[PDB]
């Protein structure tokens, strides 16, 4: 039994997965297959890929934001915080937490007496009045006030944080602005924004309108228009309502507004249209937005305090009141018609709409500015409106992290002082910190969970509740036994005997003795002379004491005994328990004045109760056993001869009571996976993919026999390069060139015109980007001789791998860069800097490129430069990937030590998808998407290899790419200050900052000098073998060439045109037998499943075997003869079911051939690969052979195969690159799924579709699990 790791490759249409074991191998396992076939076992490698469409299904609905889900899981956090306070709160005010809960259903009092309740609302009209008072508090503060402050934050927080989210050092307008442009530049490498010398803090946090601050900023970004994408983001974060339809050429108007209730959903619908690459862009806009709005706000306050947001909000409160007071007088007087429109009508923008009706600030100003301009005396009101300062409200801070940290600061201030008076607060600092800050996936160990023990979030009954005391008395009686004159054994009290006894004895005396039970009931009523009694001792312990209490006050025994007042009386005792003061009781009691005299109500209002019980009504009287329909109290009252009691009933498996209690302990023990994923920023596809990833990992752990993996290594699927977004890139390069040639005033586009699609050539682009000139030497280049010239890396590959235009120049010879191993030579910078500057200002190089060319002027590559290179390659910054990491980390690491620290047995590693992509290129494991779907699985395999190699080779780097709170090492203390300082395994890890250098056997320096590395890489300190260049590359080639890879096209049952939910197999009469395929529609579905046969009969079928009605969802998979597979699609059509595998030798060949000219890389190494393509021309035959063999066996499109085969022979002499590029088209004949037309050479090959679904009814149905590892096969031939 050995350790393993999982690699994951998460995409919007595909989850790829791979388990790897020691020495980076992929294990295999035999898997029992179920059903009616004579195949009972199958052997399977543990590597696969799940493929899924993204449409209207129930799983889609589950991943939508769901309010009742949020409510319930948030109630766990609220309730947990109450539990921590419950003990000390009991000493201050035992009814506090129950009082607040009753008032949750008023949509109001917080205190027991009228004095405190009035004094609380006079002093704390807002939560910020409270916070500020508490922070300023020198001595012990009232615990209710402390609780109320904390509870208000966690009640109204949109979403809590995960590890690595807090960043308090970079929470200011300027850095958040850079973050936005950096995130923007990641997505638009050709038209990046230079933000150098832009005072964004001053421009964006001014006393000017949003619209002016937009124009001011956009005016400082050369070439950027106000309604362009970057302007609209700035518009978004300033508080405006930009429209992104034109930036992305969208279908409809798609406008966005941060303050709206629907913004979160609105963003996901946009991402669903433009791609989840953009999500972090709109997240950067949100945090900037928050930093802007907090500066404007905090500016009003002038008092030095640990509650600066509170101090500001109090000020704005007072200013809001005066301004509203005047506006009301102005309107009442000058425009009384419009008063109710303005101040009461939430349906309209206007004050009412603005506050209680979700109209935004700008919508409100837009409505009210004309009203103000037409009135007298609105001069400064209008001034405030135009600097965005008029009647700001208080609720502008529930979401986002920049907000969260400001709140946490104030609350931590309160807790630090109040810890000195409430030891329990120091005792639970970390628990309370977790409640205030972070996601709580589970309430176990230190966070394990007044409230009803059985039902966690349900509150208890008052201990003097009449219903509670009935439960107490009946629970005791149901275990009394009696024995009479005519009996051999004792018997239980009857349903009627119990009621008889309660009516007769428990309602006439406070305590009931056993003598009374014997004499006053068993003698006098049942006429017995000898009676012995077990189950009770001197007297019963349970008393109906509140019945007797009220009997003296009401003096209407009929009223007490009447079952319909039971909840009236329950309400009365609740009220007499929650409050302690006659005026406040009598307020609440006044609704019952039609039921009692004033004589009685003066008496009732004086009858306070104190105390709370152990159980809640819902449990005792509320939940009902399914079959019997009876509550627990019902069973205590009568339960046949069984006479179960409370503790019996809870645990009896023959009653649903047990199961409902467990269903509630489960819901209250942690949060909701689907709610978590539902609230991420992303499309519904990215969310479906994350849910699949969680499913795949669960099944993989089941497969490895419940053993957890050592590491899980996650990457986000690298995206395919469509030719559509490929030509969008040409248009972008063209616009950057045109705009740059204009500002240079150079005639180069007229001397050499160029259509945009030619700019895809690296060298030609660089030639225009460089205005026709060498970049290291003052000279022109000849546009007709670019083949002779070099592409040089500004920062050498030894230090960072960056093959972008932003790290490349076009020289005559790379020797022109200078002779150093570092950035270009100081002699080159001098002769060329002024040219570079001109280019930089023309936006033909970037600020990063310029700084890098000139770096020799500043001492070359510093330690700091190198440490940031490390982080640049390691750290994956996408947000959603941090949440995938936590979700898996949450599920995997659940035990706690004897410290109350998390024991991390599974390390969840996150890698940039680039690392794997570079690895395939650096070591020739080339990817050719077109062949099959295996490359998803291959990526997950490679990702698991590269991730687990890194963590073993460079453990100290853990903190940068493993989820968790790890010891943060400074990367610069890991950087050797000379290369010879690294020949030994001292603590320094690198001199040449490409972290992937340890895989290479020889590294080439920028000048040409070559450093060798040992064939076997060991970790410095542990000595462990990490990578053996002699074995481990071969292992990888083996896994990739491996032909059987588990591919699963997720089947779907639809939910949103005659749309079918799923087909079904009917075997029946119409007499003689038919095997038919019938599609149930979404309307039909409800009916059909209710009564299958009656639905089926009314369709003309009869004498159907209902045990042979097989449900067949979309893409059900069938196997026929010779392993030919078919998938069942919609519209009575079948899809191709087989995946065609090719070994590495062929894949690499096809790749390097189709790239024979486009060959970026070393000039000698470029020929070594061209030689390989040449010397293996015979692979063209070998491939065509496999494609043909595959096609005749499973494709069955003999017509097109002949055309293809004929056309291949005729063109066998065209250059190799051409035949390969055209073989790569062929694979769409063999591709799994819907057949689709393609072109081979000149020839067009039209799709042969599969129009008869009859075929499958006698084939074998293959039902796959998510990994495809567990099959159950059903031979329909024998049906």
Describe the structure.
The protein has 1279 residues and is an alpha+beta fold. The chain folds into 7 domains: 1-54 and 683-719 and 868-1046, Ribonuclease H-like superfamily/Ribonuclease H (Nucleotidyltransferase, domain 5, 2-Layer Sandwich), CATH 3.30.420; 67-159 and 399-447, no CATH class; 168-298, no CATH class; 308-386, no CATH class; 466-663, no CATH class; 723-860, no CATH class; 1144-1258, no CATH class. Helices cover 45% and strands 10% of the residues. It contains 52 helices and 28 strands. The strands form 9 sheets. A 6-stranded mixed sheet has the order 13-10-1-2-6-18, sandwiched between helices. A 6-stranded mixed sheet has the order 4-28-27-22-23-24, with no helix packed on it. A hairpin with a 3-residue loop joins strand 19 (1060-1069) and strand 20. Helix 48 crosses helix 52 and helix 50 (1179-1195) runs parallel beside helix 52 (1216-1226). The longest helix is centred in the N-terminal third of the chain and has 27 residues, at 308-334. It is globular, with a radius of gyration of 38 Å.
Protein traits:
1279 residues; Nucleotidyltransferase, domain 5; 7 domains; six-stranded mixed sheet; 28 strands; rna binding protein; CRISPR-Cas9 variant; monomeric; CRISPR-associated endonuclease Cas9/Csn1; EC 3.1.-.-
What top-tier CATH class of the largest domain fits best? Alpha Beta
Note the main sheet.
6 strands, mixed
Tell me what portion of residues adopts beta-strand conformation: 5-15%
Distance from first to last alpha carbon: 42 Å
Q: Please, how many helices?
A: 52
Label the structural class. Answer: alpha+beta
Counted beta strands: 28
Subunit structure: Monomer. Binds crRNA and tracrRNA.
Motif (PAM substrate-binding): 1247-1249
Region (RuvC-I): 1-61
Binding site for Mn(2+) 2: 9, 719, 936
């Amino acid at each position: 039994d050995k350790k393993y790791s999982i690699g994951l490759d998460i995409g919007t249409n595909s989850v790829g997965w791979a388990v790897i074991t020691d020495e980076y191998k992929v294990p295999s396992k035999k898997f029992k297959v179920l059903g009616n076939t004579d195949r009972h076992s199958i052997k399977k490698n543990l590597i696969g890929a799940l493929l899924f469409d993204s449409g209207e299904t129930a799983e889609a609905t589950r991943l939508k934001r769901t309010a009742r889900r949020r409510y319930t899981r948030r109630k766990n956090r609220i309730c947990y915080l109450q539990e921590i306070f419950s003990n000390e709160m009991a000493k201050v005010d035992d009814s506090f937490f129950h009082r607040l809960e009753e008032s949750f259903l008023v949509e109001h009092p917080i205190f027991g007496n009228i004095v405190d309740e009035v004094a609380y609302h006079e002093k704390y009209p807002t939560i910020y009045h409270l916070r500020k008072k508490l922070v300023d508090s020198t001595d012990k503060a009232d615990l209710r006030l402390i609780y109320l402050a904390l509870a208000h934050m966690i009640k109204f927080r949109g979403h809590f944080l995960i590890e690595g989210d807090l960043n308090p050092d970079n929470s200011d307008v300027d850095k958040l602005f850079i973050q936005l442009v950096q995130t923007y530049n990641q997505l638009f490498e050709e038209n990046p924004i230079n933000a150098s010398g832009v005072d964004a803090k001053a421009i964006l946090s001014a006393r000017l309108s949003k619209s002016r601050r937009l124009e001011n900023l956009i005016a400082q970004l050369p070439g950027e228009k106000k309604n362009g994408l970057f302007g609209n983001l700035i518009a978004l974060s300033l508080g405006l309502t930009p429209n992104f339809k034109s930036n992305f050429d969208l279908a409809e108007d798609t406008k966005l507004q941060l303050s709206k209730d629907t913004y979160d959903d609105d963003l996901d619908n946009l991402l669903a249209q433009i791609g989840d690459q953009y999500a972090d862009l709109f997240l950067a806009a949100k945090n900037l937005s928050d930093a802007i709005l907090l500066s404007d706000i905090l500016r009003v306050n002038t008092e030095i305090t640990k509650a600066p947001l509170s101090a500001s909000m109090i000020k704005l409160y007072d200013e809001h009141h005066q301004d509203l007071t005047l506006l009301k007088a102005l309107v009442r007087q000058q425009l009384p018609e419009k008063y109710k429109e303005i101040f009461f009508d939430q349906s309209k923008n206007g004050y009412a709409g603005y506050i209680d009706g979700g109209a935004s600030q700008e919508e409100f100003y837009k409505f009210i500015k004309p009203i103000l301009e037409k009135m007298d005396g609105t001069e400064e009101l209008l001034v405030k409106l135009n600097r965005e300062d008029l009647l700001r409200k208080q609720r502008t801070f529930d979401n986002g992290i920049i907000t969260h940290q400001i709140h946490l600061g104030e609350l931590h201030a309160i807790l630090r002082r109040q810890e000195d008076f409430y030891p329990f607060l120091k005792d639970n600092r970390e628990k309370i910190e977790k409640i205030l800050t972070f996601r709580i996936p589970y309430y176990v160990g230190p966070l394990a969970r007044n409230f009803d023990k059985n039902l966690p979030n349900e509150k208890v009954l008052p201990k003097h509740s009449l219903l509670y005391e009935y439960f107490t008395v009946y629970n005791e009686l149901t275990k009394v036994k009696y024995v009479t004159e005519g009996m051999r054994k004792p018997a239980f009290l009857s349903g009627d005997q119990k009621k008889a006894i309660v009516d007769l004895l428990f309602k006439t005396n406070r305590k009931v003795t056993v003598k009374q039970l014997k004499e006053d009931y068993f003698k006098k009523i049942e006429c017995f002379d000898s009676v012995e009694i077990s189950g009770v001792e001197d007297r019963f312990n349970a008393s109906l004491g509140t019945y007797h209490d009220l009997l003296k006050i009401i003096k209407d025994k009929d009223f007490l005994d009447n079952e319909e007042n039971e909840d009236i009386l329950e309400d009365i005792v609740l009220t007499l328990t929650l409050f302690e003061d006659r005026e406040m009781i009598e307020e609440r009691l006044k609704t019952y004045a039609h039921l009692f005299d004033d004589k009685v109500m003066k008496q009732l209002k004086r009858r306070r109760y104190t105390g709370w019980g152990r159980l809640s009504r819902k449990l005792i009287n509320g939940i009902r056993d399914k079959q019997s329909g009876k509550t627990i109290l019902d069973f205590l009252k009568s339960d046949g001869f069984a006479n179960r009691n409370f503790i019996q009933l809870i645990h009896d498996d023959s009653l649903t009571f047990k199961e409902d209690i467990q269903k509630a302990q489960v819901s209250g023990q942690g949060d909701s996976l689907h709610e978590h994923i539902a609230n991420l920023a992303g499309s519904p596809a990215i969310k479906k993919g994350i849910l699949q990833t969680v499913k795949v990992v669960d099944e993989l752990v089941k497969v490895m026999g419940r053993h957890k993996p050592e590491n899980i290594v996650i990457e986000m699927a690298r995206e395919n390069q469509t030719t559509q977004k490929g030509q969008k890139n040409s248009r972008e390069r063209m616009k950057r060139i045109e705009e740059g040639i204009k500002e240079l005033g150079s005639q180069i586009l007229k001397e050499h015109p160029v259509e945009n699609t030619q700019l895809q050539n690296e060298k030609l682009y660089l030639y225009y980007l460089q205005n026709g000139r060498d970049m290291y030497v003052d000279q022109e280049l000849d546009i007709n001789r670019l083949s002779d010239y070099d592409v040089d890396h500004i920062v050498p590959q030894s230090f960072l791998k960056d093959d972008s235009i932003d790290n490349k120049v076009l020289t005559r010879s790379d020797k022109n860069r200078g002779k150093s191993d570092n950035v270009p030579s100081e002699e080159v910078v001098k002769k060329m800097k002024n040219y570079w500057r001109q280019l930089l200002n023309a936006k033909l190089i970037t600020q990063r490129k310029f700084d890098n060319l000139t770096k020799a002027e500043r001492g070359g590559l510093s330690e700091l430069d190198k440490a940031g290179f490390i982080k640049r390659q390691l750290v994956e910054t996408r947000q959603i990937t941090k949440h995938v990491a936590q979700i898996l980390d949450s599920r995997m690491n659940t035990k706690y030590d004897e410290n109350d620290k998390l024991i991390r047995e599974v390390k969840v590693i996150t890698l940039k998808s680039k690392l794997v992509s570079d690895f395939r290129k650096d070591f020739q494991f080339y990817k050719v998407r077109e062949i099959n779907n295996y490359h998803h699985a291959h990526d997950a395999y490679l990702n698991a290899v590269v991730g687990t190699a890194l963590i073993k080779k460079y453990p100290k780097l853990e903190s940068e790419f493993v989820y968790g709170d790890y010891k943060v090492y400074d990367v610069r203390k890991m950087i050797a200050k000379s290369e010879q300082e690294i020949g030994k395994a001292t603590a320094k890890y690198f001199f040449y900052s490409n972290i992937m250098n340890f895989f290479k056997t020889e590294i080439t320096l920028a000048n040409g000098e070559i450093r060798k590395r040992p064939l076997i890489e060991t970790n410095g300190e542990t000595g462990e073998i990490v990578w053996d260049k002699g074995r481990d590359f071969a292992t990888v080639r083996k896994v990739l060439s491996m032909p059987q890879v588990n591919i699963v096209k997720k089947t779907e049952v639809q939910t949103g045109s005659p749309t079918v939910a799923y087909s079904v197999l009917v075997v029946a009469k119409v007499l003689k037998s038919v095997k038919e395929l019938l599609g149930i529609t979404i309307m039909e579905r409800s009916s059909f499943e209710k009564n299958p046969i009656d639905f089926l009969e009314a369709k003309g079928y009869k004498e159907v075997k209902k045990d042979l009605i097989i449900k067949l969802p979309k893409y059900s998979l069938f196997e026929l003869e010779n392993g030919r597979k078919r998938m069942l699609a919609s519209a009575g059509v079948l899809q191709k079911g087989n995946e065609l595998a090719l070994p590495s030798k062929y894949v690499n060949f096809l790749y390097l051939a189709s790239h024979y000219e486009k060959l970026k890389g070393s000039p000698e190494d470029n020929e070594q690969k061209q030689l390989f393509v040449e010397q293996h021309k015979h692979y063209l035959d070998e491939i065509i052979e496999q494609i043909s063999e595959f096609s005749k066996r499973v494709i069955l499109a003999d017509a097109n195969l002949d055309k293809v085969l004929s056309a291949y022979n005729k063109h066998r002499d065209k250059p190799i690159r051409e035949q390969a590029e055209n073989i790569i088209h062929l694979f769409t004949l063999t591709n799994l799924g819907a057949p689709a037309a393609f072109k081979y050479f000149d020839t067009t090959i039209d799709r042969k579709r599969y129009t008869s679904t009859k075929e499958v009814l006698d084939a074998t149905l293959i039902h796959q699990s998510i990994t495809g590892l567990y099959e159950t096969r059903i031979d329909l031939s024998q049906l």
